[PDB]
Ligand binder design. Structure first.
Ligand code: SF4
Ligand code: SF4
Ligand code: FES
Lengths: 56, 230
């Protein structure tokens, strides 16, 4: 949170323990944006020699 | 008396001695997927999509030209058949351009229809894809021959019905061009009808051009004028 003295004591004294993840969600943990570019898998089929469309 | 019992999926049907396989399956409601065969045009073995398995018989027979002896049992959905259809569709789609956005028949062309409702769902074969020099013919018929599947329909029609005899094939293997060798204009009465017979977007209507698209248009029965044939 922002610098808080004696008011954060008020809040610690009213509603109990707090300060883990201030309700406002504003502190880091934003993941940056896509450090790697995404690359996706491809599931079953998408393979020659295994399959004919009739079976699957 | 000049009738023959031949099973279809175990369902007997009485047909004439010498009606084709494809007709015999038409009678009970099977429509075997096809290209080069056409109701008004003589038979040819070109498309190969008509393949169908007959039980007890090792090889698959082409349903277009195969006459029906007594007691053939025609299995349409037998695994061997479906594998054959997937194969043929694959080899056709091997060399074809991707024109479906630009191509005029996109809402119609039977490669898309039969492609979904029969052939396999994923292609193969990366390095490939031959191309063909396109050939201007008439003012009526716009011509992109890259899309040609070389199914011989246009030939057989021009020959037999139109009677002009000016269309043919020149080449072998991958390279066979279907059309006039000398780059002559082909124009006749009934000639325009060829744009209906070409199953793919190879031939199309020049004036109708790009304006419309099949699913968007509302068909309406009508009659004709300008000719007393009604
Ligand atoms: S000929 Fe058929 S499959 Fe080929 S681009 Fe045209 S609509 Fe698509
Ligand atoms: S131009 Fe059309 S009708 Fe003629 S062989 Fe090619 S695909 Fe068939
Ligand atoms: S109809 Fe039998 S080969 Fe085309």
């Amino acid at each position: 949170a922002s610098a808080t003295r004696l008011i954060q004591g008020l809040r610690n004294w009213a509603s109990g323990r707090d300060l883990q993840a201030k309700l406002q969600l504003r502190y880091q943990e934003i993941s940056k944006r896509t450090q790697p570019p995404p690359k996706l898998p491809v599931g079953p089929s998408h393979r020659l020699s295994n399959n004919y469309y009739c079976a699957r | 008396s000049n009738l023959i019992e031949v099973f279809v999926d175990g369902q007997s049907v009485m047909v004439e001695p010498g009606t084709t396989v494809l007709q015999a399956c038409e009678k009970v409601g099977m429509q075997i997927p096809r290209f080069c065969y056409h109701e008004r045009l003589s038979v040819a073995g070109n498309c190969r999509m008509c393949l169908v398995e007959i039980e007890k018989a090792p090889k698959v027979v082409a349903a277009c030209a195969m006459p029906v002896m007594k007691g053939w049992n025609i299995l349409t959905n037998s695994e061997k058949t479906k594998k054959a259809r997937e194969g043929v569709m694959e080899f056709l789609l091997a060399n074809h351009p991707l024109d479906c956005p630009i191509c005029d028949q996109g809402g119609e062309c039977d490669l898309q229809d039969q492609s979904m409702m029969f052939g396999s769902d994923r292609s193969r074969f990366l390095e490939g894809k031959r191309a063909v020099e396109d050939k201007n013919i008439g003012p009526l018929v716009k011509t992109i021959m890259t899309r040609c599947i070389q199914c011989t329909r246009c030939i057989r029609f021009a020959s037999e019905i139109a009677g002009v005899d000016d269309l043919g094939t020149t080449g072998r293997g991958n390279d066979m061009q279907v059309g006039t060798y000398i780059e002559k204009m082909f124009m006749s009465e009934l000639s325009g009808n060829i744009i209906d017979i070409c199953p793919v977007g190879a031939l199309t209507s020049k004036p109708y051009a790009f304006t419309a698209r099949p699913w968007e248009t509302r068909k309406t029965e009508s009659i004709d004028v300008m000719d007393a044939v009604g």
